[PDB]
Write an enzyme that holds these catalytic residues in place. Structure first.
Site, PDB file in Angstrom:
ATOM      1  N   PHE A   2     -14.720   1.927  -0.315  1.00 13.82           N
ATOM      2  CA  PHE A   2     -15.002   0.510  -0.490  1.00 13.82           C
ATOM      3  C   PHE A   2     -16.496   0.265  -0.268  1.00 13.82           C
ATOM      4  CE2 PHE A   2     -13.169  -3.859  -0.276  1.00 13.82           C
ATOM      5  CZ  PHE A   2     -14.216  -4.552   0.287  1.00 13.82           C
ATOM      6  N   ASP A   3     -17.145  -0.489  -1.156  1.00 18.24           N
ATOM      7  CA  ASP A   3     -18.546  -0.829  -0.972  1.00 18.24           C
ATOM      8  C   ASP A   3     -18.748  -2.323  -1.186  1.00 18.24           C
ATOM      9  OD1 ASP A   3     -21.566  -0.578  -0.894  1.00 18.24           O
ATOM     10  OD2 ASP A   3     -21.311  -0.876  -3.093  1.00 18.24           O
ATOM     11  N   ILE A  44     -23.734   1.170 -14.051  1.00 14.84           N
ATOM     12  CA  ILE A  44     -22.687   1.612 -14.954  1.00 14.84           C
ATOM     13  C   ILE A  44     -22.562   0.637 -16.124  1.00 14.84           C
ATOM     14  CG2 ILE A  44     -21.453   3.025 -13.291  1.00 14.84           C
ATOM     15  CD1 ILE A  44     -19.583   0.548 -12.861  1.00 14.84           C
TER      16      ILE A  44
HETATM   17  C1  LIG Z   1     -30.843  -0.727  -9.294  1.00  9.61           C
HETATM   18  C2  LIG Z   1     -29.451  -0.539  -8.720  1.00  9.61           C
HETATM   19  C3  LIG Z   1     -29.246   0.898  -8.956  1.00  9.61           C
HETATM   20  N1  LIG Z   1     -27.934   1.353  -8.411  1.00  9.61           N
HETATM   21  C4  LIG Z   1     -26.958   1.862  -9.215  1.00  9.61           C
HETATM   22  C5  LIG Z   1     -25.941   2.218  -8.434  1.00  9.61           C
HETATM   23  C6  LIG Z   1     -24.635   2.869  -8.891  1.00  9.61           C
HETATM   24  O1  LIG Z   1     -23.615   1.926  -8.732  1.00  9.61           O
HETATM   25  C7  LIG Z   1     -23.210   1.226  -9.792  1.00  9.61           C
HETATM   26  O2  LIG Z   1     -23.815   1.232 -10.863  1.00  9.61           O
HETATM   27  C8  LIG Z   1     -22.085   0.401  -9.577  1.00  9.61           C
HETATM   28  C9  LIG Z   1     -22.392  -1.012 -10.061  1.00  9.61           C
HETATM   29  C10 LIG Z   1     -23.528  -1.573  -9.169  1.00  9.61           C
HETATM   30  C11 LIG Z   1     -22.976  -1.689  -7.798  1.00  9.61           C
HETATM   31  C12 LIG Z   1     -22.686  -0.357  -7.217  1.00  9.61           C
HETATM   32  N2  LIG Z   1     -21.817   0.452  -8.112  1.00  9.61           N
HETATM   33  C13 LIG Z   1     -20.871   1.286  -7.688  1.00  9.61           C
HETATM   34  O3  LIG Z   1     -20.218   1.936  -8.477  1.00  9.61           O
HETATM   35  C14 LIG Z   1     -20.653   1.476  -6.213  1.00  9.61           C
HETATM   36  C15 LIG Z   1     -21.686   2.316  -5.714  1.00  9.61           C
HETATM   37  C16 LIG Z   1     -22.435   1.938  -4.581  1.00  9.61           C
HETATM   38  C17 LIG Z   1     -23.417   2.743  -4.041  1.00  9.61           C
HETATM   39  O4  LIG Z   1     -24.169   2.447  -2.948  1.00  9.61           O
HETATM   40  C18 LIG Z   1     -24.441   1.059  -2.825  1.00  9.61           C
HETATM   41  C19 LIG Z   1     -23.684   3.960  -4.634  1.00  9.61           C
HETATM   42  O5  LIG Z   1     -24.692   4.795  -4.108  1.00  9.61           O
HETATM   43  C20 LIG Z   1     -25.935   4.376  -4.654  1.00  9.61           C
HETATM   44  C21 LIG Z   1     -22.955   4.351  -5.752  1.00  9.61           C
HETATM   45  O6  LIG Z   1     -23.314   5.563  -6.239  1.00  9.61           O
HETATM   46  C22 LIG Z   1     -22.610   5.999  -7.415  1.00  9.61           C
HETATM   47  C23 LIG Z   1     -21.943   3.542  -6.286  1.00  9.61           C
HETATM   48  C24 LIG Z   1     -19.291   2.188  -5.943  1.00  9.61           C
HETATM   49  C25 LIG Z   1     -18.098   1.241  -6.308  1.00  9.61           C
HETATM   50  C26 LIG Z   1     -16.807   2.014  -5.933  1.00  9.61           C
HETATM   51  C27 LIG Z   1     -16.703   2.091  -4.437  1.00  9.61           C
HETATM   52  C28 LIG Z   1     -17.792   3.068  -3.868  1.00  9.61           C
HETATM   53  C29 LIG Z   1     -19.194   2.768  -4.494  1.00  9.61           C
HETATM   54  C30 LIG Z   1     -26.281   1.973  -7.155  1.00  9.61           C
HETATM   55  N3  LIG Z   1     -27.523   1.430  -7.125  1.00  9.61           N
END
Ligand SMILES: CCCn1cc(COC(=O)[C@@H]2CCCCN2C(=O)[C@H](c2cc(OC)c(OC)c(OC)c2)C2CCCCC2)cn1
Length: 128
Positions: free
Chosen positions: A55-56, A75
């Site tokens: 969960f985030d 994404i």
């Molecule tokens: C300029 C922002 C760049 N950024 C992209 C991301 C990748 O994440 C995502 O693109 C999507 C959508 C934006 C919010 C975060 N996102 C995620 O998937 C979360 C996400 C948060 C993260 O940390 C906040 C993260 O690490 C950076 C990550 O890495 C793939 C993904 C997931 C959602 C499912 C539950 C666990 C985390 C993280 N920061």
């Protein structure tokens, strides 16, 4: 189940129309204006994976989550989904893995072929 409600009652906002990103609106926003590619966008969100194992939230600070829309900084699902949202809107997305992290996943956080759910609030957007 918020995710089941979306899986059952949610709008398919993909172009290919493959149900890969499904949306229900939860709080109607203000105006007709929704953001353009290259806009800096400000959101609060809560996210989980279908496994129930991670969960985030942005709410894990006061700092909101900030990206440039349509630039693939997030994404594909978000570049699609947020672009449909108006200032002040809140919405639920359910995302098949092909619009998230795909078959490779992103280990160890995200497994292979994961399905994701998000609650998103759109605070505001501005032209970079
Ligand atoms: C300029 C922002 C760049 N950024 C992209 C991301 C990748 O994440 C995502 O693109 C999507 C959508 C934006 C919010 C975060 N996102 C995620 O998937 C979360 C996400 C948060 C993260 O940390 C906040 C993260 O690490 C950076 C990550 O890495 C793939 C993904 C997931 C959602 C499912 C539950 C666990 C985390 C993280 N920061």
């Amino acid at each position: 189940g918020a995710p089941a409600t979306v899986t059952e009652q949610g709008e398919d906002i993909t172009s290919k129309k493959d149900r890969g990103v499904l949306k229900i609106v939860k709080r109607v926003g203000n105006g007709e204006e929704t953001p353009m590619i290259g806009d800096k966008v400000y959101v609060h969100y809560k996210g989980k994976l279908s496994n129930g194992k991670k969960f985030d939230s942005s709410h894990d600070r006061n700092e909101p989550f900030v990206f440039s829309l349509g630039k693939g900084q997030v994404i594909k699902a978000w570049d699609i989904g947020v672009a449909t949202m108006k200032k002040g809107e809140i919405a639920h997305l359910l995302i098949k893995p092909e619009y998230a992290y795909g078959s490779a996943g992103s280990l160890p956080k995200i497994p292979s072929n994961a399905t994701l759910f998000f609650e998103i609030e759109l605070l505001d957007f501005k032209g970079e």
